Amino acid sequence: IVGGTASVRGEWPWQVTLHTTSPTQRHLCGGSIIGNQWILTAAHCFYGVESPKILRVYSGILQQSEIKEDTSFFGVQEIIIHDQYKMAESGYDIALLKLETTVQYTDSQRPISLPSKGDRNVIYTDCWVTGWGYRKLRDKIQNTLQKAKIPLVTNEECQKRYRGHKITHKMICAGYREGGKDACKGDSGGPLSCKHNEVWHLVGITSWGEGCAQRERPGVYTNVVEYVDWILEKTQ
Template sequence: MRIPFEITILLILCLRNKSYKCHAVHVGCGTRPRKRAKIVGGTDAQAGSWPWQVSLQMERYGHVCGASLVASRWLVSAAHCFQDSDVFVYVLAGILMPATRQIRRIILHSQYDQFTSDYDIALLELSAPVFFNELVQPVCVPASSHAFTSGTSCFVTGWGVLSEEGELATLLQEATVNIISHNTCNKMYDDAVTPRMLCAGNIQGGVDACQGDSGGPLVCLERGRRWFLAGIVSWGEGCARQNRPGVYTRVIKFTDWIHQQTKEQRQPLRLSLLVVI
């Protein structure tokens, strides 16, 4: 992979125009310490609802893709978000206290296929950790043996367009989608869904991820009341169309790869990251 000479990334973590103290608060992955009593067909997310949600933005053009915080130094996103990263300058912005970070590396899966969208996953390493607080928490990465069963109700979140060919959302959107069986989805997509892919949505249409949601999280609430990263927004035919559900990178197929890559240590590249958290 060709990595651009200098990349900055804007990290927006679910909240705008609020003032909170940034202090170390970590109660385990997949938790939402702050809970208050468009994705196509979604609704506005409340502040702090999805504390692992990240927005990757071009400096001049704004939001490009989503990502998820999985550890204090690591983000997970979709590989296709970085196909043309050599022509992009990304800016990372959060909401709270600004700080500058260096990005050590952007790792695309070596088997990523841009024509089939297979192995559509990327890792972004920060040279310095972010601080966990009420609004910044990592999502849980599931074990490779974990099963997200068909019919399970999960959530997809992002700042993507609110309708096919529509405008980007100004507020983080959330929507409930159901896991669809691999066989059922493959019939609808003429066997284009590989074992590394997971389908979720509504077969009747009306609710779906769309352009700008790519790389963002599909999360499911599991026993123990923790949220697990089941999928990464990858591709689909149109948005919220009947018999065309969203297709996600199936995270359990990459659990070992994520752990292997995040444990390795390499020298930092000359990439910069501005973080406001």
């Protein structure tokens, strides 16, 4: 996260870190707890992941250095990728992870609600993006979970900044005109969380963008509301 600050223990309990063991163990992507054995993330994270066996979902983690060899994780039983996904910029950058076991909800690990279908005429103004991603375009992956407050920009407005691509209604954009605050590489698949009437909602999944925190270049997120039917169908 570019231009953010450090999160506190249990500030974003739905945030998970998604590890790969091949070739060696490292943070791959972000994800959100939405059900007892369901992580909502971005499809582009799994390019070149061939077996769900090389994945490790760690929850209740604030700092990466908390993860030791004996720290427990949730195994991925199934990776579900939207049939229509081809690449981030084309859309359908959405994926589910069905965990081998259910999460035991505590204060440091617990779920975020999806938006409602009637919540499509709702305008979120209290939105936050979170991850262990890069602090700048040419950086590394952070030890402490970073947070940054960011305002949504309208699909129409976003489209003007990105004439190199099509910005569909199944996407949502968020950024500052002058930039400075944005998600970055490694934040992918993590949450953009917006608070509506004291209830936190999963409004977007971190998908892509032109560089990181560039001015006039808003972050692009998978519009979660446009997928509730897809998600519910899959989460059974």
